[PDB]
């Protein structure tokens, strides 16, 4: 009975319903992201169940503002809830403060929102990690908010089922030197290596960036660079 509600600590001060939501994210399709000096690139492997989807279906990458986006990893519907909240924060920043939301701020807001659903018996934690990619006045930034609401900045990041491998491949990259052009290639390449073929037979790799070439607008990358 220690593990049925997120309002409860176990005897070791764990919150199991959060660890469990965590597992939802780890059993999900893989995402990676890299924060360069010219921008952020985020890529994610969409696993279809049907051969008959439209290309575009179940986008896991959403813009949240002109300069920021969120790639979701885990339960896509839960993520669209976060994406909606991120968008409300971004709008608020523009409407009240007349400034684009800084990325650290956006990720904090996202984290606070996710964390809130780990405190109260009536809601459950979200089953998704959000990767936030911003390029506002704070510069290129890449955060991840996990279901606990813990938020961390990264140079590069990998989530989902192939996360342990994808991290090994992301460690081979030189983040000080790497550019958004190169990264679209590398990050996509990485998701092709770590994809398991005999399990998940149907897959595209969705990529998005926000960078100096995109006029610091967060956008899917044209499907010529992939």
């Amino acid at each position: 009975g220690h593990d049925q509600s997120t309002d409860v600590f176990s005897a070791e001060g764990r919150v199991f319903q959060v660890e469990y939501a965590g597992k939802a994210v780890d059993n999900s399709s893989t995402a990676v992201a890299a924060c360069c000096k010219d921008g952020v690139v985020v890529a994610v492997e969409k696993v279809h169940t049907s051969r008959m989807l439209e290309k575009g279906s179940n986008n896991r990458i959403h813009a949240v503002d002109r300069q920021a986006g969120i790639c979701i990893c885990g339960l896509l519907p839960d993520g669209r809830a976060i994406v909606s909240r991120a968008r409300q924060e971004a709008e608020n920043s523009r409407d009240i403060f007349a400034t684009p939301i800084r990325g650290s701020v956006l990720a904090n807001r996202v984290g606070e929102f996710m964390h809130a659903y780990t405190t109260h018996f009536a809601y459950r934690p979200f089953g998704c990690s959000a990767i936030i990619a911003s390029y506002a006045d704070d510069g290129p930034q890449l955060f991840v908010s996990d279901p606990s609401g813990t938020v961390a900045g990264y140079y590069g990041v990998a989530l989902g089922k192939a996360k342990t491998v994808a991290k090994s491949e992301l460690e081979k990259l030189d983040f000080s030197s790497l550019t958004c052009d190169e990264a679209v290639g590398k990050l996509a390449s990485i998701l092709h290596e770590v994809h398991d073929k005999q399990k998940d037979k149907l897959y595209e790799v969705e990529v998005a960036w926000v960078c100096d070439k995109s006029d610091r607008k967060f956008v899917h990358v044209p499907a010529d660079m992939v």
Binding site: Q67, P100, A136, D137, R216
Partner: protein, 228 residues
Amino acid sequence: TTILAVSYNGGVVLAADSRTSSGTYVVNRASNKLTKLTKKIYCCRSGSAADTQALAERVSNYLGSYQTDIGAGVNVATAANLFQKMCYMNRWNISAGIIVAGYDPINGGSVYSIPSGGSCVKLDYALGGSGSIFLYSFFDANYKPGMSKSECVAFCQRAVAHAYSRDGSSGGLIRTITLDADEPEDQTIPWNRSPYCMEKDPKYVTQATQNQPFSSSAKITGNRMSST
């Protein structure tokens, strides 16, 4: 309306803009608010055109009678005094700022302000009209007395231009007349040779930055001028 008058050594300049407005529409964009009372004595009229035209016509009439009767020139004080009387007798029923200014040989050039209550005050210069509120600082700051005729004309033109560049109720031409021992010189500066306007001041050429384009930064660039 912007009317003003200024003394110089030996005479006066009167100046005015030319606009008569029914609130926010201009019914007359070439009114003459410098109204002759005698040869060398003029008023500038502000307030109700009707009222001020009626008084000026009345005073000019009285003063012509009076000049024919005493067989000599009229003093500006007499003209101001009459104007004051009439303005004060009718103070409740008229809207009327007057300036009476002119030249007479005994007292040189004089200027009298007769504002709405019917006070009459003898000054070095006088301002009247809705536009005058804009010139007080301009005079305080930029008017030095002892100017020549020609300097004084140019200064009054500038002063009117400044006023009517900010008063919505003044505008159009700038009419001036000088009044001294010599013949009256009237002048009319058309708006397009106005010695000042905001539409040609270089410090009002850059547009305020109100319509910023949607950006990823707080850095302000400019107005969005094109859709692309």
